[PDB]
Paper text:
CA forms the capsid shell surrounding the viral core that protects and transports the viral genome and also interacts with host cell factors that are necessary for trafficking, nuclear entry and proviral integration. Further, we assemble particles from [name] CArec in vitro and use single-particle cryogenic electron microscopy (cryo-EM) to determine the high-resolution structures of four different types of Fullerene shell assemblies. Our studies of [name] CArec show that an ERV retains the ability to form capsid assemblies using the same architecture as exogenous viruses. Analysis of the shell structures reveals the intra- and inter-molecular interactions that drives CA assembly into pentamers and hexamers and their association into shells that encapsidate the retroviral genome.
To guide the structural interpretation of these particles at higher resolution, we determined the 1.8 Å crystal structure of the CArec N-terminal domain (CArec-[name]) and the solution NMR structure of CArec C-terminal domain (CArec-CTD). CArec-[name] has the same N-terminal β-hairpin and six-helix fold observed in exogenous orthoretroviral CA proteins. Structural superimposition with exogenous retroviral CA domains revealed the strongest similarity of CArec-[name] with the CA-[name] of the beta and alpharetroviruses Jaagsiekte sheep retrovirus (JSRV) and Rous sarcoma virus (RSV) (Z-scores 10.7 and 9.0) and the most distant relationship to the CA-[name] of the gammaretrovirus MLV. Importantly, although α11 displays the sequential and medium-range inter-residue nuclear Overhauser effect (NOE) cross-peaks that define a helical conformation, the higher T2, lower T1 and lower heteronuclear 1H-15N NOE values observed in NMR relaxation experiments together indicate it is more dynamic than the core domain (α7–α10). These high-resolution structures could be docked directly into the cryo-EM density and, with the additional building of the [name]–CTD linkers, the [name]–CTD interface and helix α8 at the CTD–CTD interface, refined well into each particle structure. Exceptions were the N-terminal β-hairpin that contains a large loop insertion and is more mobile than in the crystal structure, and the [name]–CTD linker region of D5 and D6 equatorial hexamers that displayed weaker density.
Residue numbers in the entry:
A (entry chain B): 1 to 5, 21 to 149
B (entry chain A): 1 to 6, 23 to 151
The structure:
Amino acid sequence: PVTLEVEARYKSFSIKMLKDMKEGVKQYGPNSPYMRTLLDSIAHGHRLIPYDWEILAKSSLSPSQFLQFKTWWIDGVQEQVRRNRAANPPVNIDADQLLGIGQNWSTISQQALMQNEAIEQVRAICLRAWEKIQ
Amino acid sequence: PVTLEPARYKSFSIKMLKDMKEGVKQYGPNSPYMRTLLDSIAHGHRLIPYDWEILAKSSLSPSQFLQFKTWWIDGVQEQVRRNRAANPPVNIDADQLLGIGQNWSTISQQALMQNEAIEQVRAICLRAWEKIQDP
């Protein structure tokens, strides 16, 4: 997660939290009330960049579950970019920022400068993607 | 939880607290389910004593809550003995670990707690939670 001291600083997830979450997904399922409670609290209790989401997902999910998450992340990005382009005025956030990739957004330091609207879009897209894991 | 390390505070969502209360109702405070969920939350967020109080009070029956608080205080008493006896001494007292008194009763004060104190609070409260008995 990113903290805004404004000066943005990145702090990695707790190793124990990650271990807890991987074991919880395994025992209860990625969308059990168990995981929904935990994940929602983390997502809304922190400023998460795409890097954070990639870490949470890759660490917590089985390989097949992770593939599902990524496809739905990409699906949510398609829809979001469409809404961004159609907004009046257009919202200048594209897929590179929402996925955390490319020359402008691939590094943690770049992503840490993401504005509120972008953070909110990433949060909604990734929570939806997680919820769509079957 | 505290949203900026030493600083400000954001409450748990009403929904999250409802889920925790339902989880305790369905599975009990010391199900592996609740134990690992609590552990996850406690390592996923920076919890001050005020958070622990809200979580416990919201999730537990009055008698379970009294047990939790009794064991939190007991664990604090043991931790303070250890802090005093440490070489060098750890300058963390019972009022900080419990979030009480002139120095620590407010969220604004608690939000300035450093890592060692947050960690001590976490260990003590997780242990106290485990000491709660079922109906």
